[PDB]
Amino acid sequence: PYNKIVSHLLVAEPEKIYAMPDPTVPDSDIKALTTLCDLADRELVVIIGWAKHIPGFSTLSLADQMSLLQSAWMEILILGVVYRSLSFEDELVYADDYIMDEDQSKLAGLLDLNNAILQLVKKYKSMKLEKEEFVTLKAIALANSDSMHIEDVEAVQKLQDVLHEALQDYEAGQHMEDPRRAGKMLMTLPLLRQTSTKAVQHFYNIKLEGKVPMH
Amino acid sequence: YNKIVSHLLVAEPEKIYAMPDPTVPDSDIKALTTLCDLADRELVVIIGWAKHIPGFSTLSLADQMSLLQSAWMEILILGVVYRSLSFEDELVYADDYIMDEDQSKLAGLLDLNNAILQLVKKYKSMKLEKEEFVTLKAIALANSDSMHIEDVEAVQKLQDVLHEALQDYEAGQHMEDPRRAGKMLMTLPLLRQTSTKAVQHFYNIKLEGKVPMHKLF
Numbered sequence: 001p002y003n004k005i006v007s008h009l010l011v012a013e014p015e016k017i018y019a020m021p022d023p024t025v026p027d028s029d030i031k032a033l034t035t036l037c038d039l040a041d042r043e044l045v046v047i048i049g050w051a052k053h054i055p056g057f058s059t060l061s062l063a064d065q066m067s068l069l070q071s072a073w074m075e076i077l078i079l080g081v082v083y084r085s086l087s088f089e090d091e092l093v094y095a096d097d098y099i100m101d102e103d104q105s106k107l108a109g110l111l112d113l114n115n116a117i118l119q120l121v122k123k124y125k126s127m128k129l130e131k132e133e134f135v136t137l138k139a140i141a142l143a144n145s146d147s148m149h150i151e152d153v154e155a156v157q158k159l160q161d162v163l164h165e166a167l168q169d170y171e172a173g174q175h176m177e178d179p180r181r182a183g184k185m186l187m188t189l190p191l192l193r194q195t196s197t198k199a200v201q202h203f204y205n206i207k208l209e210g211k212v213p214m215h
Numbered sequence: 216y217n218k219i220v221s222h223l224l225v226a227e228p229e230k231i232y233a234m235p236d237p238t239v240p241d242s243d244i245k246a247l248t249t250l251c252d253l254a255d256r257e258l259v260v261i262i263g264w265a266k267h268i269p270g271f272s273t274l275s276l277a278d279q280m281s282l283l284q285s286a287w288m289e290i291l292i293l294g295v296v297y298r299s300l301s302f303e304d305e306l307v308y309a310d311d312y313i314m315d316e317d318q319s320k321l322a323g324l325l326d327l328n329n330a331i332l333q334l335v336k337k338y339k340s341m342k343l344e345k346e347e348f349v350t351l352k353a354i355a356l357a358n359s360d361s362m363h364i365e366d367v368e369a370v371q372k373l374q375d376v377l378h379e380a381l382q383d384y385e386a387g388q389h390m391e392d393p394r395r396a397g398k399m400l401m402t403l404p405l406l407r408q409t410s411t412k413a414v415q416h417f418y419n420i421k422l423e424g425k426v427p428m429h430k431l432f
């Protein structure tokens with residue numbers, strides 16, 4: 001018997017989402033990037049519904065809800081990719097039907113970024129990150145996104161406390177062998193934030209270059 | 216009482232002053248020039264401070280420089296933040312160089328300084344103590360995530376030694392909040408984010424050659 005928040009978060013996990021790359025269209029960076037952006041777009045739609053399932057989130061004002069999502073969507077997407085890539089080696093599982101190896105990365109111009117994301121994967125691998133910890137870290141990442149536009153700081157901190165508490169309690173009961181596992185999990189957040197920032201900046205140097213824009 | 220924390224306390228370098236020059240009329244170039252020179256001198260002191268962190272100088276000199284290379288700005292920023300806790304909407308880069316909103320606009324540092332203040336705000340609300348400050352500073356260095364680390368295991372060991380010290384300190388001094396250590400650790404992402412913005416601003420200024428950069432250049 002362990003944490004109810006954690007079990008609930010496991011139950012609230014979105015069903016698999018597919019990239020669905022178009023076979024008819026020949027491989028090319030514009031293709032890969034176009035595919036990754038459509039996938040992300042569809043995942044973002046899902047993240048909004050998913051967020052309603054987070055204990056303590058729906059009680060925030062709509063403005064604060066949007067501010068948190070706006071600041072943490074990339075961290076949430078990246079964590080997902082990372083968790084799906086744990087049983088793999090030097091490959092990123094953006095989706096079951098879209099797994100990127102080194103060559104597919106070079107061919108898309110995502111070598112640097114994908115290598116940075118692989119660094120997150122590596123750290124979580126060594127720790128043997130569990131699905132329970134993964135879902136709790138996603139919610140924590142959302143609550144701890146540090147938006148400068150928050151209207152109700154106290155309420156946001158309460159969301160953080162509730163999820164932080166769930167993690168600490170889960171670790172206390174399932175990993176008594178390492179009394180600092182909760183802390184180690186929290187210490188992975190800086191790299192997540194850092195990697196998300198590099199991804200966002202990348203998504204701009206291309207949306208910008210007229211890569212696959214209109215935006 | 217905690218040994219690691221006590222040691223970090225006495226290992227604190229003493230104050231470094233900015234020493235702004237009056238023969239020079241205030242401008243943006245003056246502010247940037249001043250801040251860069253201040254950072255340069257703080258960096259010399261930081262390198263020596265790191266050698267006193269338990270298990271640090273014992274790492275390969277490569278790993279040693281790797282952690283510093285990835286964490287120097289976070290360490291600089293945490294200092295400014297800590298020194299600014301007692302103030303309001305002001306940044307104490309040094310006792311003789313306190314920047315308010317007006318000065319930030321003049322140096323073209325309004326957005327960066329506002330971001331740094333966001334960090335001050337969080338720590339002010341938590342009532343960050345000196346003991347927690349020095350410990351987080353050491354943790355920021357050890358948890359800097361350099362992509363060049365040779366001995367990962369040893370670096371993780373260093374993180375664990377500092378983390379245990381923080382966890383132990385919070386258990387004794389703050390049994391009132393059984394989650395204080397975790398909350399301290401949760402401020403690290405904002406520290407990384409703000410430092411990244413600082414570094415980006417810094418290298419853009421260099422790229423633009425906006426500041427008369429010596430140093431052998």
Ligand SMILES: CC/C(=C(/CC)c1ccc(O)cc1)c1ccc(O)cc1
Nearest residue numbers: 036037040077078081199202203206
């Ligand atoms: C790194 C690819 C990516 C994105 C986000 C749309 C991207 C696309 C193009 C770029 O130039 C940079 C990042 C992404 C897609 C789905 C996820 O679950 C997580 C990340």
Ligand SMILES: CC/C(=C(/CC)c1ccc(O)cc1)c1ccc(O)cc1
Nearest residue numbers: 250251254291292295413416417420
């Ligand atoms: C944010 C100003 C700054 C720097 C350090 C070089 C700076 C200067 C000019 C820039 O364009 C960007 C950053 C700094 C100085 C002392 C500290 O303890 C911490 C940070």
